[PDB]
């Protein structure tokens, strides 16, 4: 900064403290009262949600191995498993609605092969409707899945 009269050097450390720290101390987060940062990703106004969050763990997966000692990942606030429940309890619902239809077809017609035509009918129709939404632009939504159930 300076060299005062008598040959003395004024340095930047002599006038100021110098540590390596954040550019913005306005916010600091805890995870169960433990010191932590994190990536709160927000969606992109038309993006494919669960597909986006699938490859959020693709990029993140290659990061894990080169971590310093102690650095571990944790998963609060996450939407992925709600999708996994609305398929394994809709496609479950689906199956129960067939199985029950099957026994009503037995109680009215005791013929085992007659309680079979309608059992092969609706599984086929379900599938063709997947192919129509694919051609029209739609996705496997929370809505359209309930549309197969109704």
């Amino acid at each position: 900064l300076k060299v005062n009269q008598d040959g003395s050097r004024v340095l930047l450390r002599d006038v100021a403290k110098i540590e390596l720290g954040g550019e913005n101390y306005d916010i600091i987060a805890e995870f169960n009262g433990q010191p932590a940062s994190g990536l709160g990703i927000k969606l992109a106004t038309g993006a494919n949600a669960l597909d986006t969050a699938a490859a959020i763990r693709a990029e993140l997966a290659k990061m894990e191995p080169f971590f310093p000692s102690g650095l571990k990942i944790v998963y609060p606030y996450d939407t992925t498993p709600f999708v996994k429940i609305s398929i394994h309890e809709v496609v479950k619902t689906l199956v129960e609605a067939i199985i029950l239809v099957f026994l009503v077809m037995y109680l009215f017609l005791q013929n085992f092969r007659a309680t079979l035509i309608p059992t092969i009918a609706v599984p086929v129709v379900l599938l063709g409707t997947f192919a129509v939404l694919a051609a029209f632009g739609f996705s496997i939504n929370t809505l359209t899945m309930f549309g197969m159930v109704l």
Binding site: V132, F136, L143, G147
Partner: protein, 47 residues
């Protein structure tokens, strides 16, 4: 005549009363399956 006209929706209730049609691809396929095939199977085999 009850389903697709109710899929003349509007606004943020856009894909809401829209994705009927999802229903109707399914209905016209149930007609198709019951106009093709079911006629066949019924004859093909029953009692």
């Amino acid at each position: 005549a009850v389903f697709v006209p109710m899929a003349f929706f509007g606004g943020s209730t856009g894909a809401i009363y829209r994705q009927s049609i999802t229903i109707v691809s399914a209905m016209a396929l149930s007609v198709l399956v019951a106009l093709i095939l079911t006629p066949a199977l019924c004859a093909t085999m029953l009692k």
